[PDB]
Amino acid sequence: MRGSHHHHHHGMASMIVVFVGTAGSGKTTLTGEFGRYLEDNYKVAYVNLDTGVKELPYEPSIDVREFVTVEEIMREGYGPNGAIVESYDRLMEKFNEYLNKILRLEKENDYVLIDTPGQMETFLFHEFGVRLMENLPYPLVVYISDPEILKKPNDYCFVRFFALLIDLRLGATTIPALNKVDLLSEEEKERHRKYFEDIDYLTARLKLDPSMQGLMAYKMCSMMTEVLPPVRVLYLSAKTREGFEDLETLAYEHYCTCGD
Amino acid sequence: MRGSHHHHHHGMASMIVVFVGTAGSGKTTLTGEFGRYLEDNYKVAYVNLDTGVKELPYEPSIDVREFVTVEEIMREGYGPNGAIVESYDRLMEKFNEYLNKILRLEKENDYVLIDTPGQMETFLFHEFGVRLMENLPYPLVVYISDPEILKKPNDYCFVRFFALLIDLRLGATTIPALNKVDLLSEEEKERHRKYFEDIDYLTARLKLDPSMQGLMAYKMCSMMTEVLPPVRVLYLSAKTREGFEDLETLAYEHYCTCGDL
Numbered sequence: 001m002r003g004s005h006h007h008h009h010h011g012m013a014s015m016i017v018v019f020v021g022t023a024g025s026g027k028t029t030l031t032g033e034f035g036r037y038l039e040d041n042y043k044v045a046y047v048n049l050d051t052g053v054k055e056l057p058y059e060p061s062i063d064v065r066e067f068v069t070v071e072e073i074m075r076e077g078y079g080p081n082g083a084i085v086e087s088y089d090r091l092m093e094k095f096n097e098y099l100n101k102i103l104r105l106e107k108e109n110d111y112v113l114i115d116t117p118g119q120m121e122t123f124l125f126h127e128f129g130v131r132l133m134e135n136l137p138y139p140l141v142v143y144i145s146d147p148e149i150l151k152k153p154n155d156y157c158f159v160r161f162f163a164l165l166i167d168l169r170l171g172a173t174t175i176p177a178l179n180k181v182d183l184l185s186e187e188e189k190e191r192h193r194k195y196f197e198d199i200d201y202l203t204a205r206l207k208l209d210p211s212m213q214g215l216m217a218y219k220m221c222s223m224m225t226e227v228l229p230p231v232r233v234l235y236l237s238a239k240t241r242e243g244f245e246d247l248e249t250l251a252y253e254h255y256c257t258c259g260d
Numbered sequence: 261m262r263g264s265h266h267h268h269h270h271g272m273a274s275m276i277v278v279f280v281g282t283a284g285s286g287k288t289t290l291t292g293e294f295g296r297y298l299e300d301n302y303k304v305a306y307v308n309l310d311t312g313v314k315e316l317p318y319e320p321s322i323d324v325r326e327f328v329t330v331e332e333i334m335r336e337g338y339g340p341n342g343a344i345v346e347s348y349d350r351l352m353e354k355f356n357e358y359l360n361k362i363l364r365l366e367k368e369n370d371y372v373l374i375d376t377p378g379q380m381e382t383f384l385f386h387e388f389g390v391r392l393m394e395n396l397p398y399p400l401v402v403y404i405s406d407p408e409i410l411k412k413p414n415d416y417c418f419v420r421f422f423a424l425l426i427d428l429r430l431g432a433t434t435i436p437a438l439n440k441v442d443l444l445s446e447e448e449k450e451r452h453r454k455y456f457e458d459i460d461y462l463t464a465r466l467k468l469d470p471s472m473q474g475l476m477a478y479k480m481c482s483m484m485t486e487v488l489p490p491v492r493v494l495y496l497s498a499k500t501r502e503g504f505e506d507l508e509t510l511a512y513e514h515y516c517t518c519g520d521l
């Protein structure tokens with residue numbers, strides 16, 4: 001219930017779930033709503049690593065905006081994109097402090113949801129993101145995409161390889177997912193699934209592309225067979241909780257598999 | 261010379277150079293300073309597609325900030341990142357007009373230098389970036405990195421695979437490049453060189469690392485070998501002009517290569 005105070009057993013690993021996605025895919029919404037969902041049964045904590053966001057749909061236990069905001073930095077005459085980078089250079093000075101707060105949380109909660117910088121590139125190309133991720137115990141990364149970017153076959157290969165890239169970069173199990181599935185006509189929904197679920201089929205459609213660019217993508221589906229096999233893409237809705245049971249199951253499974 | 265009014269033969273294709281890189285990599289400075297270098301000998305045009313840049317070191321022929329800014333939109337109550345996405349959603353209403361203006365520029369100039377949104381992901385994930393790139397004639401993408409992220413062998417893989425991802429998403433030849441090389445000791449420069457361009461010494465190297473990450477890096481890195489005949493890499497300085505000739509040459513090679521067929 002909203003008023004439940006769920007108990008976490010102190011000598012027990014929590015589940016850290018980290019949401020990553022380009023600006024606008026629904027990171028902050030998914031954290032809040034997946035949080036609510038879990039709160040029926042679990043002790044959840046919320047970490048906001050995003051210095052830009054104007055308002056939160058959840059009460060954070062940790063909030064980097066308490067320390068500095070993009071808006072504050074822009075007051076110093078920085079442009080927005082400059083203020084965003086500058087904001088993570090400043091937080092980096094306080095790295096251990098935040099690393100240790102997050103680690104504390106992980107001892108005190110069943111779940112810790114991390115809502116990452118609004119721009120995925122801050123998290124992936126700045127020292128703050130990767131150094132945090134190196135230092136967290138088996139964090140589970142949910143990489144979400146707006147389905148509206150899936151307009152041609154090689155987009156499906158794009159998203160899949162980007163998740164792999166994220167998994168390389170952050171050194172964490174990355175789950176590729178779609179958000180905003182609430183908006184998907186069911187034809188749209190089955191297309192996406194077929195391309196994602198049927199890599200023989202995907203590969204074949206990419207075979208047809210005559211472009212110089214098409215050949216490379218068709219080829220790039222070397223992912224498979226001898227290592228790199230396509231993992232199931234999750235379909236989520238942060239508005240309706242479609243896929244929340246899935247996500248929760250996956251996150252528990254990942255949790256059982258780790259600590260081994 | 262720079263003050264010359266260079267003549268471009270209308271029936272003669274130009275070189276379109278697109279600077280892409282994460283925010284802070286030096287996109288805007290590189291675009292400005294490379295153009296100034298080019299301006300001695302060619303007729304250059306500048307396109308700014310970044311709604312969130314405060315000042316330009318160059319005079320743009322095209323400036324999407326004249327339609328809207330991230331800052332203007334934030335005054336509406338959007339956060340920075342909300343406004344960045346919004347600025348480009350609104351920009352889409354003016355898509356053909358921008359496309360057509362740029363298409364004109366390429367008929368009228370030797371070089372069109374395009375300075376992309378400050379957040380790379382804005383360009384890579386937004387319809388405005390993808391469709392523009394789709395509609396340009398053989399643009400050459402230059403993907404710059406800050407050498408500071410290059411700390412261990414796995415990082416070199418990450419950054420070269422990324423470039424590959426840009427190629428694939430944007431459907432254009434993409435040159436992995438380092439910017440800010442002026443800040444590098446000669447010792448630093450040489451480390452970057454053996455890993456960063458030489459991808460037998462990278463692969464080889466990743467192969468020795470028996471960890472999960474090293475394994476996967478090794479794997480993704482070999483897939484690159486078979487996926488493209490390793491491009492030439494660039495070591496630029498937007499500040500001192502190091503690598504400009506090399507960039508200029510690679511552009512000309514790309515130009516001839518796209519010429520015949």
Ligand SMILES: Nc1nc2c(ncn2[C@@H]2O[C@H](COP(=O)(O)OP(=O)(O)O)[C@@H](O)[C@H]2O)c(=O)[nH]1
Nearest residue numbers: 023024025026027028029179180182237238239
């Ligand atoms: N219909 C629908 N809208 C969503 C969903 N997730 C997010 N949104 C909306 O998409 C916009 C971007 O969401 P936001 O959470 O800020 O994404 P962020 O930049 O990654 O943090 C907001 O207006 C959300 O209300 C979803 O699953 N379905």
Ligand SMILES: Nc1nc2c(ncn2[C@@H]2O[C@H](COP(=O)(O)OP(=O)(O)O)[C@@H](O)[C@H]2O)c(=O)[nH]1
Nearest residue numbers: 283284285286287288289378439440497498499
């Ligand atoms: N030392 C050095 N600094 C650079 C170079 N290029 C850019 N910078 C600096 O890095 C900061 C980011 O430059 P900017 O063009 O705004 O990067 P952008 O966000 O990708 O457009 C600026 O303060 C530049 O002066 C370079 O080649 N060398």
